[PDB]
């Protein structure tokens, strides 16, 4: 998650390109892509408008390839949980928008020495999934509560501890990656509208 | 479509070379000097037998493989190397040194019953006249031994950045090639981006 | 100074080079630009400690001073001097060395030379 | 050790059958690689997007269903 | 015989056991063309 920390921070002091986007690709797109993990990696990409052939210069960018699971590794804190799953290296390619993002441009990403294209129709998802988190997170809190609870380290996070536990129920915790690319359903900026409307 | 039609360039410029370069009927001469052994006389014979049908095999191959298995062979590289000069724009490589002209790229074929490529990275050898117009052989670059036509079983081609070929069957013998390259000149610079870097 | 004018050249050539492979941002926004004019304006948008978390104090001017990939004094370090002692004389004979005269060993603290 | 030098003046002759140059496919811009090249990169990327498209689609049911619950609680 | 010079590395099992070269692949271009049509 460093990775895209720090190509945020690259894009937004410099501007070597006008928005971002955040990508984690997974072991077995690499496998089938011709490319290795676990080899020296220095990663590029370049925007190809097309139709024309026009090529905007290569730009480097930050690439961190996790190892184990890398979808919990977004979602876990370290002290409390270790993750599980498959893992690809982070990456965030550069784009070329503002005004109505043109389909069929591609995203062209370079890795040691094969190419990956990324149309930007298959990039850009219209609706987030920004629901499923606070489901994802009173959980997260539930575990912190009920590790402090029993490991017994030191005074200040035993208040706090305390404190989740008298705000909402100590019954269980676990996280679970994996479970998020299923059970969601596309988050729309209307819903809430809907409840209040009808309250 | 762009890289299959740019490798299908590559592979007619390159067929249609040794295509008139062996269309007269020819007696080949082993341009590189290499002492055969008095028992080896009918290894060399053999290999007068298999010339037809190694070079139809050849053929055959370099044309159906697709391309992303190309584009790292030597081939495109001094296909690209060729188009830098022409395109009337500084084009510079990713990891690899300038050709330097003289130098002539290799990529070797197995010689026995199945034709596959053996050489995972190309070969840099250099040629250079020596007595009675026998070109010496000697590499820098790279470390593979059986050089070319050193050792049976590796037909060796390589194209020098001038574009101009050489085939060595086993036991030295081959013949000199030239190539002319027929592609359209207002999408040179797209392939150019798309194979260098342009700074 | 001595050191400050001796070293010139190195200072000059260090000062521009050393900030190198830091990312700058775009152009510094007009906001940077620290006001002035506001300190000695009787009248002027004013606010009294203790209401300061998100009051209706929304109308102070804001101010950001962004220094991100500008020259550091560590950027601009180019030379170091630490105080052996005290001598009288300096000869030159012999591979050429320099023999001291009366050298007396008093070793002091290191100094830094930026400016 | 004593072994045959090398010398320009060696050659070999392989029998060559004279019909070896208007080999059909040979020479001509190759068609059939590109075009099915074409054709199965086209086949899979539709399959791509379909299933991407189908996997939004997948809610459209639900949604016209949850949308008119008050209109049983507003009677 | 002299000069510290390279020798043809010979197949080290007689000659007669090193095949004539070849290609199969069954895999024809212009049928596929049609399948996919």
């Known amino acids: 998650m460093d990775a895209h920390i720090a190509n945020e921070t690259k894009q937004q002091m410099t501007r070597f390109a006008p928005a971002l986007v955040h990508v984690i690709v997974p072991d077995p797109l690499l496998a089938r892509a011709g490319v290795d993990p676990l080899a020296p990696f220095a990663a590029h990409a370049q925007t190809r408008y097309h139709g024309s052939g026009v090529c905007e210069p290569w730009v480097s960018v930050f690439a961190g390839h996790v190892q184990t699971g890398a979808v919990e590794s977004v979602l876990t804190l370290p002290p409390l949980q270790r993750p599980r799953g498959p893992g690809g290296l982070f990456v965030s390619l550069p784009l070329a928008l503002g005004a109505h993002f043109d389909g069929f441009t591609t995203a062209a990403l370079r890795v040691g020495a094969r190419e990956l294209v990324f149309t930007y129709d298959e990039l850009l998802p219209a609706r987030t999934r920004y629901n499923v988190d606070g489901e994802r997170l009173e959980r997260l809190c539930r575990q912190f509560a009920n590790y402090a609870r029993a490991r017994r380290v030191a005074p200040a996070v035993a208040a706090a501890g305390g404190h989740i536990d008298a705000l909402l129920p100590p019954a269980a915790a676990t996280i679970d990656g994996e479970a998020q690319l299923t059970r969601g359903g596309f988050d729309d900026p209307a819903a809430p509208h809907a409840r209040d409307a009808d309250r | ?199 | 100074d001595a050191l400050s004018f001796l070293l010139a050249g190195t200072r000059v050539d260090n000062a521009i080079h050393g900030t190198d492979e830091a990312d700058a941002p775009a152009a510094p926004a007009a906001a940077a630009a620290f006001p002035a004019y506001l300190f000695n304006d009787p009248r002027s948008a004013r606010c009294p400690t203790g209401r300061l978390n998100t009051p209706a104090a929304e109308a102070l001017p804001v101010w950001a001073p962004d220094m991100r990939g500008r020259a550091t004094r560590n950027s601009c370090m180019y030379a170091a001097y630490v105080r052996l002692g005290t001598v009288e004389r300096v000869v030159r004979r012999a591979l050429p060395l320099a023999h001291m005269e009366r050298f007396t060993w008093d070793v002091g603290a290191w100094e830094e030379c930026f400016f | 050790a004593a072994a045959i030098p090398g010398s320009a003046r060696h050659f070999i002759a392989p029998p060559f059958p004279v019909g070896f140059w208007a080999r059909p496919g040979f020479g001509e811009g190759l068609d059939a690689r590109l075009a099915l090249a074409h054709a199965n990169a086209r086949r899979r990327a539709a399959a791509a997007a379909l299933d991407n498209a189908m996997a939004a689609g997948a809610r459209l049911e639900a949604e016209v269903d949850e949308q008119l619950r008050p209109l049983e609680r507003q009677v």
Not at chain 2, 33 to 52: H, N, W
Not at chain 2, 79 to 88: D, N, Y
Not at chain 2, 169 to 186: D, H
């Open chain 2, 1 to 199: 479509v762009l890289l299959e039609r740019f490798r299908n360039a590559c592979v007619r410029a390159l067929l249609a070379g040794v295509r008139e370069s062996v269309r007269r009927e020819p007696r080949m001469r082993q341009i590189i000097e290499f002492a055969i052994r008095p028992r080896d006389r009918e290894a060399v014979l053999d290999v007068a037998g298999r010339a037809p049908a190694l070079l139809d095999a050849f053929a055959r191959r370099l044309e159906h493989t697709p391309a992303r298995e190309m584009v790292d062979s030597g081939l495109m590289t001094a296909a690209a190397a060729h188009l830098a000069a022409r395109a009337t724009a500084g084009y510079v490589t990713f990891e690899s040194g300038p050709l330097l002209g003289g130098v002539f790229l290799f990529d070797y074929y197995s010689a026995g019953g199945e034709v596959i490529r053996v050489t995972r990275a190309p070969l840099a050898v250099a040629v250079e006249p020596a007595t009675r117009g026998q070109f010496a052989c000697r590499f820098r670059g790279a470390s593979h031994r059986c050089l070319p036509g050193e050792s049976y079983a590796y037909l060796c081609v390589g194209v020098s950045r001038d574009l101009r070929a050489l085939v060595v069957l086993p036991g030295g013998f081959g013949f000199f090639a030239t190539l002319r390259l027929e592609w359209p000149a207002a999408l040179v610079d797209p392939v150019l981006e798309r194979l260098c870097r342009r700074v």
